[PDB]
Amino acid sequence: TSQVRQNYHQDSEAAINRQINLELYASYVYLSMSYYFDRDDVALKNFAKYFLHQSHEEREHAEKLMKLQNQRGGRIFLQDIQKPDEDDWESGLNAMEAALHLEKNVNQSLLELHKLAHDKNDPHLADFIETHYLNEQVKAIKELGDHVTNLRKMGAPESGLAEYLFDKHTLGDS
Template sequence: MAMEQPEMEPRYLAESNAAINSQIQLQLYAAYIYLSMAFFCNQDEVALVNFALYFLCQSQKWMESTEKLFHFLIQRNGSLVLGRIADQQRHDWCDGLMAMECALHLEKTLNQSLLQLYQLANSKGDACFCSFLKRHFLQQQVEIIKEMGGYVTNLRQLGAPGNRLAEHFFDRLTLGESTKEN
């Protein structure tokens, strides 16, 4: 099912397709990092099972969102250019708080990139692309950043990182309930 679009200048289409490919790469990187966080939290010595489930869910969400961008790009007759996913610097998150703080930073980076995509589309009057970004990405980013910011605040109020018990209570009570809902 092809989208109806007004005629757009070829230079803009090339620029937007490159920007979409760049966003795809960033989202694949995010899925990769979240997967790494999930396995870190699931280690016996860390034992934050619900943190692991939360990060695994975030990885899956970014993979699903990336598929939406794939389809959007194809519908615009763009070509998918998959490069190598950026190398992950060795992450020793040390604890759940540090992993959540890194996740929050990652989401802010993804949000900024999506806002730049939106600005590009808006500046060229690409209403279809603007609508797509609003419907599938922008509101969800506001919600996840707010959620993760709240989680970081709660963890700090409970005494993390100094109090390891705080992370375990947060894992069981807050993230445990959150993962049951999802």
């Protein structure tokens, strides 16, 4: 057992390892989406750029969790990163909706990790979760919901004009 461990339950250690796999999964989903919008029969550069940013952000999420595992004295165990459910993401609107489902899934996973940390009276772990994950999740969810709302009111996905313009006017400056 390691010299820095203190107040660190094994249930928490397992949970962090599960969360690492989840954040890498999300990274892979977003990479898949990004390059779907790179296809010559979709060709929406700013959708592609948007989801590529999200994919690198989730990779950083995963790395912060791994640093945390080592900080608290736990051992990293890595597992396979399952492939996204889809290879074809249909449309900008549909990709954004899958991103909404994804982030809500990841959010309930964090909220249970927080439940877990408060119940094993691990306040350091709890505040780590609050400070570095919980509000980033709320922000990501509000943002993807704003986008789904605008794509819908424009006429997406029935109107290809709507997705083109959304790509130029909303994902062209941030």
